[PDB]
Design an enzyme around this catalytic site. Structure first.
Site, PDB file in Angstrom:
ATOM      1  N   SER A  60      87.671   6.177  16.047  1.00 32.42           N
ATOM      2  CA  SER A  60      88.281   7.008  17.084  1.00 32.42           C
ATOM      3  C   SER A  60      89.765   6.812  17.293  1.00 32.42           C
ATOM      4  O   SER A  60      90.386   7.549  18.041  1.00 32.42           O
ATOM      5  CB  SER A  60      87.586   6.810  18.417  1.00 32.42           C
ATOM      6  OG  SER A  60      86.237   7.306  18.295  1.00 32.42           O
ATOM      7  N   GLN A 120      68.821   5.228  17.610  1.00 37.03           N
ATOM      8  CA  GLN A 120      68.457   4.096  16.783  1.00 37.03           C
ATOM      9  C   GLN A 120      69.550   3.941  15.755  1.00 37.03           C
ATOM     10  O   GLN A 120      69.908   4.899  15.079  1.00 37.03           O
ATOM     11  CB  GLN A 120      67.111   4.352  16.071  1.00 37.03           C
ATOM     12  CG  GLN A 120      66.039   4.660  17.148  1.00 37.03           C
ATOM     13  CD  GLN A 120      64.666   4.724  16.582  1.00 37.03           C
ATOM     14  OE1 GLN A 120      63.656   4.301  17.163  1.00 37.03           O
ATOM     15  NE2 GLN A 120      64.541   5.276  15.383  1.00 37.03           N
ATOM     16  N   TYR A 157      83.462   9.595  28.256  1.00 36.95           N
ATOM     17  CA  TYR A 157      83.913   9.633  26.858  1.00 36.95           C
ATOM     18  C   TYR A 157      82.946  10.448  26.022  1.00 36.95           C
ATOM     19  O   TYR A 157      81.715  10.214  26.079  1.00 36.95           O
ATOM     20  CB  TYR A 157      84.028   8.228  26.335  1.00 36.95           C
ATOM     21  CG  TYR A 157      84.581   8.113  24.957  1.00 36.95           C
ATOM     22  CD1 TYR A 157      83.778   7.898  23.856  1.00 36.95           C
ATOM     23  CD2 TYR A 157      85.950   8.154  24.741  1.00 36.95           C
ATOM     24  CE1 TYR A 157      84.318   7.782  22.583  1.00 36.95           C
ATOM     25  CE2 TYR A 157      86.519   8.020  23.488  1.00 36.95           C
ATOM     26  CZ  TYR A 157      85.685   7.833  22.404  1.00 36.95           C
ATOM     27  OH  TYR A 157      86.267   7.672  21.160  1.00 36.95           O
ATOM     28  N   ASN A 159      82.613  12.294  21.996  1.00 38.63           N
ATOM     29  CA  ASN A 159      83.140  12.775  20.718  1.00 38.63           C
ATOM     30  C   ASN A 159      83.258  14.298  20.668  1.00 38.63           C
ATOM     31  O   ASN A 159      84.139  14.797  19.941  1.00 38.63           O
ATOM     32  CB  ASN A 159      82.233  12.296  19.599  1.00 38.63           C
ATOM     33  CG  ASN A 159      82.455  10.813  19.354  1.00 38.63           C
ATOM     34  OD1 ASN A 159      83.536  10.396  18.957  1.00 38.63           O
ATOM     35  ND2 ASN A 159      81.439   9.989  19.581  1.00 38.63           N
ATOM     36  N   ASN A 325      77.774  -2.326  15.589  1.00 38.31           N
ATOM     37  CA  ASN A 325      76.567  -2.568  16.347  1.00 38.31           C
ATOM     38  C   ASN A 325      76.381  -4.059  16.605  1.00 38.31           C
ATOM     39  O   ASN A 325      75.284  -4.602  16.461  1.00 38.31           O
ATOM     40  CB  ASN A 325      75.324  -1.951  15.680  1.00 38.31           C
ATOM     41  CG  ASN A 325      74.143  -1.909  16.630  1.00 38.31           C
ATOM     42  OD1 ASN A 325      74.257  -1.562  17.811  1.00 38.31           O
ATOM     43  ND2 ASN A 325      72.951  -2.262  16.128  1.00 38.31           N
TER      44      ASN A 325
HETATM   45  P1  LIG Z   1      85.070   6.223  18.257  1.00 37.89           P
HETATM   46  O1  LIG Z   1      85.446   5.174  17.275  1.00 37.89           O
HETATM   47  O2  LIG Z   1      84.833   5.840  19.669  1.00 37.89           O
HETATM   48  C1  LIG Z   1      83.686   7.216  17.619  1.00 37.89           C
HETATM   49  C2  LIG Z   1      84.041   7.871  16.260  1.00 37.89           C
HETATM   50  N1  LIG Z   1      82.547   6.277  17.482  1.00 37.89           N
HETATM   51  C3  LIG Z   1      81.506   6.330  18.306  1.00 37.89           C
HETATM   52  O3  LIG Z   1      81.382   7.139  19.179  1.00 37.89           O
HETATM   53  C4  LIG Z   1      80.414   5.300  18.050  1.00 37.89           C
HETATM   54  C5  LIG Z   1      79.341   5.838  17.110  1.00 37.89           C
HETATM   55  C6  LIG Z   1      78.002   5.007  17.000  1.00 37.89           C
HETATM   56  C7  LIG Z   1      78.417   3.667  16.364  1.00 37.89           C
HETATM   57  C8  LIG Z   1      77.251   2.746  15.997  1.00 37.89           C
HETATM   58  N2  LIG Z   1      76.383   2.455  17.132  1.00 37.89           N
HETATM   59  C9  LIG Z   1      75.088   2.814  17.229  1.00 37.89           C
HETATM   60  O4  LIG Z   1      74.486   3.375  16.358  1.00 37.89           O
HETATM   61  C10 LIG Z   1      74.441   2.427  18.572  1.00 37.89           C
HETATM   62  N3  LIG Z   1      72.929   2.655  18.407  1.00 37.89           N
HETATM   63  C11 LIG Z   1      77.827   1.423  15.485  1.00 37.89           C
HETATM   64  O5  LIG Z   1      78.113   1.480  14.281  1.00 37.89           O
HETATM   65  O6  LIG Z   1      78.038   0.449  16.256  1.00 37.89           O
END
Ligand SMILES: *P(=O)([O-])[C@@H](C)NC(=O)CCCC[C@H](NC(=O)C[NH3+])C(=O)[O-]
EC number: 3.4.16.4
Length: 345
Positions: A60, A120, A157, A159, A325
C-alpha cells in the site's frame, strides 16, 4: 533530529528474525549519509542472504504513488477533489455524494472486498494469486456489501478506495496507471528499481522472496513471491527498493512532486488512532520522542514495508521484512522508525 541508532536498528531486525521473518532489512537516508542494515535470508530454501538492494513488493505504499498522480491531475485542472466520483466515472458508486477527497482519505464508506478474499490467509492467497481482475470487478465485489458509513463520516481503511483511484487515473488520462507512474514519478525521480508490472507475476531483477505465515501457529511458510497482485493494482502492486522509496518520500515531503497547495491537501489529517493520521494516500505516525513521520506501510503476502520520511524530507527510512500474517514481526518492524528518527534512548 537525533542521530539514527544503528545498534537499535540491528536489535529490531534480530528480533524480527526471532519472531519468524526469514529476512529483515532497513535503509536510512539521513540528509546525505546512508545507514543500511540487513539480517537473514532473501530465499529461505537456498539460503541466499537478504540485502538492502533486494527488490520487493511495497503493498500500500502504492497508494501514495496513486495519490501523487491524482494530485498532479488536480494541479493540471483535470480533477477536483471535492467533486463526486460519479462525475468522472458515471454510475460507478451507489451514492453521488461520495467525493474524490473522501475516497483518497478512506472516508467514503466503501467496503473493503479484501476482507472477503482473505478471511483465511493461505486459502485466500491461493484463490487470488493467479487471478486477473478488472478495476470494475473489484468495485463490484465491494458494492455487494453496503457502505459502512455515510460519505465522509468515518475513517475506514479500504483498498476499494484506491481501486477507484486507479480507475480515475486511467479514465481521466486515457493511459494505464503503469504509464502514469512511469512518466510522472519513476522516470523523473530515476527510480531504477521501481516497477508496476501487473498482471505479471515475476519480480524483475534480484529480489527478496516473500514468505506468507499460515494462520496455524507454527505452520510451514508459503512462498508467496510470485503473484499478480491484481486484487490490489493501484492500491498495492508497485515493486521497489529501499533506496527508491526513500527517494520517493523525500521528494514528496520536500515539495518536488506537486504544488504546495496540493501537498497541503495531502497532509490534511483524518484521525486513525491516537498516534496516527491519514491524509490523501499518506500516513502520519507519531513516534515516542515527539517526532511525526510521513509515508505509508505495506502488507502484501510475504512482505511487510514501512517507508516514512520527516516533514521536510531530509531523513527517510524504508524497512522490509519478507514475511506477512505475523503481527509480532509487523509490530517489531515499526520500531525501525523509533530507532531511525528518535535515536538512542
Ligand atoms: P496495503 O499494503 O495496506 C494493502 C495492499 N494490503 C492489505 O490490505 C492487506 C492484505 C491481506 C494481507 C495478508 N493478511 C491476511 O490474509 C489476513 N487473513 C497478509 O499477507 O498478512
Amino acid at each position: 533530529l537525533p542521530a539514527p541508532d544503528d545498534t537499535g536498528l540491528q536489535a529490531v531486525l534480530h528480533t524480527a528474525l526471532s519472531q519468524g521473518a526469514p529476512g529483515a532489512m532497513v535503509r536510512v537516508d539521513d540528509n546525505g549519509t546512508i545507514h543500511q542494515l540487513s539480517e537473514g535470508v532473501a530465499d529461505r530454501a537456498t539460503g541466499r542472504a537478504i540485502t538492502t538492494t533486494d527488490r520487493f513488493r511495497v503493498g500500500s505504499v502504492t497508494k501514495s504513488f496513486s495519490a501523487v498522480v491524482l494530485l498532479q491531475l488536480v494541479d493540471e485542472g483535470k480533477l477536483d477533489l471535492d467533486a463526486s466520483v460519479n462525475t468522472y466515472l458515471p454510475g460507478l458508486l451507489p451514492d453521488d455524494r461520495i467525493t474524490v477527497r473522501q475516497v483518497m482519505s478512506h472516508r467514503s464508506g466503501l467496503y473493503d472486498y479484501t476482507n472477503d478474499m482473505f478471511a483465511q490467509t493461505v486459502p485466500g492467497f491461493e484463490s487470488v494469486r493467479n487471478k486477473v481482475f478488472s478495476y470494475q470487478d473489484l468495485i463490484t465485489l465491494s458494492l455487494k456489501h453496503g457502505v459502512t458509513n455515510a460519505p465522509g463520516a468515518a475513517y475506514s481503511y479500504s483498498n476499494t478506495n484506491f481501486v477507484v483511484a486507479g480507475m480515475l487515473i486511467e479514465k481521466l488520462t486515457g493511459h494505464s496507471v503503469a504509464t502514469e507512474y512511469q512518466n510522472r514519478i519513476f522516470t523523473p525521480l530515476n527510480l531504477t528499481d521501481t516497477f508496476y508490472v501487473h498482471p505479471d507475476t515475476v519480480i524483475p531483477g534480484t529480489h527478496a522472496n516473500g514468505y506468507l505465515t499460515p494462520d496455524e501457529a507454527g505452520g510451514a511458510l508459503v512462498d508467496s513471491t510470485e503473484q499478480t497482485v491484481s486484487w490490489a493494482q493501484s492500491a498495492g502492486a508497485v515493486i521497489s527498493s529501499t533506496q527508491d522509496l526513500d527517494t520517493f518520500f523525500s521528494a514528496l515531503m520536500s515539495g518536488q512532486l506537486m504544488s504546495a497547495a496540493q501537498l497541503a491537501q495531502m497532509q490534511q489529517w483524518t484521525t486513525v488512532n491516537s498516534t496516527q493520521g491519514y491524509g490523501l494516500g499518506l500516513r502520519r505516525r507519531d513516534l515516542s520522542c515527539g517526532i511525526s513521520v510521513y509515508g505509508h506501510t505495506g502488507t502484501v503476502q510475504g512482505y511487510y514495508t514501512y517507508a516514512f520520511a520527516s516533514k521536510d524530507g531530509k531523513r527517510s527510512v524504508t524497512a522490509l521484512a519478507n514475511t506477512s500474517n505475523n503481527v509480532n514481526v509487523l509490530n517489531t518492524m515499526a520500531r525501525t522508525l523509533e530507532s531511525a528518527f528518535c535515536g538512542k534512548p
